[PDB]
Amino acid sequence: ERLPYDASKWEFPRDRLKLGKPLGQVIEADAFGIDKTATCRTVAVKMLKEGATHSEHRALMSELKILIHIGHHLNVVNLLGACTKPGGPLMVITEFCKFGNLSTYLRSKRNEFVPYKVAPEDLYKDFLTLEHLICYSFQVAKGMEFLASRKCIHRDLAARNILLSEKNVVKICDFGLLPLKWMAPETIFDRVYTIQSDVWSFGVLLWEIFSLGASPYPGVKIDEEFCRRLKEGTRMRAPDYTTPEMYQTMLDCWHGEPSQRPTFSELVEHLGNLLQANAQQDRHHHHHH
Numbered sequence: 001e002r003l004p005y006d007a008s009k010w011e012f013p014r015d016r017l018k019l020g021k022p023l024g025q026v027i028e029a030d031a032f033g034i035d036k037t038a039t040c041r042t043v044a045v046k047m048l049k050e051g052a053t054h055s056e057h058r059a060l061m062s063e064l065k066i067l068i069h070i071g072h073h074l075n076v077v078n079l080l081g082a083c084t085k086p087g088g089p090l091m092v093i094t095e096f097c098k099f100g101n102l103s104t105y106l107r108s109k110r111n112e113f114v115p116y117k118v119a120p121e122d123l124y125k126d127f128l129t130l131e132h133l134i135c136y137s138f139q140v141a142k143g144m145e146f147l148a149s150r151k152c153i154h155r156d157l158a159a160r161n162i163l164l165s166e167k168n169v170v171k172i173c174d175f176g177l178l179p180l181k182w183m184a185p186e187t188i189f190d191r192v193y194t195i196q197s198d199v200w201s202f203g204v205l206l207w208e209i210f211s212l213g214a215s216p217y218p219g220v221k222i223d224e225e226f227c228r229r230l231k232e233g234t235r236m237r238a239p240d241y242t243t244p245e246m247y248q249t250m251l252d253c254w255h256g257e258p259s260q261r262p263t264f265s266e267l268v269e270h271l272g273n274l275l276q277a278n279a280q281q282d283r284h285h286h287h288h289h
């Protein structure tokens with residue numbers, strides 16, 4: 001809230017928005033002239049319900065200022081404008097990501113997956129591959145490195161909070177706002193949220209990605225015994241689409257001591273190298289077959 005609000009730069013006229021169908025509250029809409037292109041654009045709008053508690057108002061208002069303060073980054077949902085002046089409801093507008101959350105998307109591609117491609121490639125039009133999985137991981141790491149470098153803590157980093165746009169570009173959203181499955185031990189037992197606890201979560205996210213949309217800790221009940229084992233040191237087993245290195249990155253993220261966990265910067269470099277390693281390998285697979 002301390003943060004300022006430049007209406008000149010962000011305010012957008014309400015009658016320039018055509019509110020469409022709901023998505024989640026979040027609504028799909030068309031905005032005319034929302035950006036320089038002065039064209040029509042599909043956008044996602046988060047708005048307050050009729051007569052919302054003045055608490056929900058500043059809540060959504062701070063959501064808008066967080067976005068304005070954080071700034072722009074390709075891997076973080078982009079703020080396009082807002083309706084804050086009197087005359088209608090408060091609305092925060094962001095770019096639209098047509099494919100939705102990464103989790104649901106990955107689940108829908110389980111029958112359309114191959115670790116890598118070889119000619120004839122049309123046998124794999126729009127197929128998910130290891131490069132895709134590692135690439136999504138890389139992008140989210142960069143987004144997190146971006147948020148972290150700004151003292152911003154996600155608090156709920158999971159696949160459902162990752163959105164997918166055109167050309168396999170993923171974006172982080174709903175930051176700084178059961179979920180026990182993504183919470184680090186210290187967050188559960190001490191209620192402590194740090195950048196390092198977001199790393200633990202990144203670990204669960206990795207698992208989601210390499211399980212192609214699976215729910216973490218399958219078959220396990222989330223009770224006292226579950227939390228205890230998390231403390232004892234017990235960890236999920238490798239997911240079905242993981243590579244050896246990736247599962248170790250998960251384990252690293254799930255280190256008991258927060259300080260011993262990798263930083264998002266380290267993770268960006270690591271996943272970056274994995275991505276290249278995979279590409280080289282793929283070039284060979286592709287060249288000899």
Ligand SMILES: COc1cc2nccc(Oc3ccc4c(C(=O)NC5CC5)cccc4c3)c2cc1OC
Pocket residue numbers: 023024026044045046063064066067077092093094095096097098099100101163172173174175176177
């Ligand atoms: C096709 O399905 C969807 C596509 C979507 N594409 C883009 C954005 C969507 O919802 C969102 C997600 C996060 C925010 C935040 C925000 O992240 N605020 C925190 C930054 C403080 C602030 C303001 C509006 C938002 C709209 C979408 C929702 C969908 O359905 C659920």
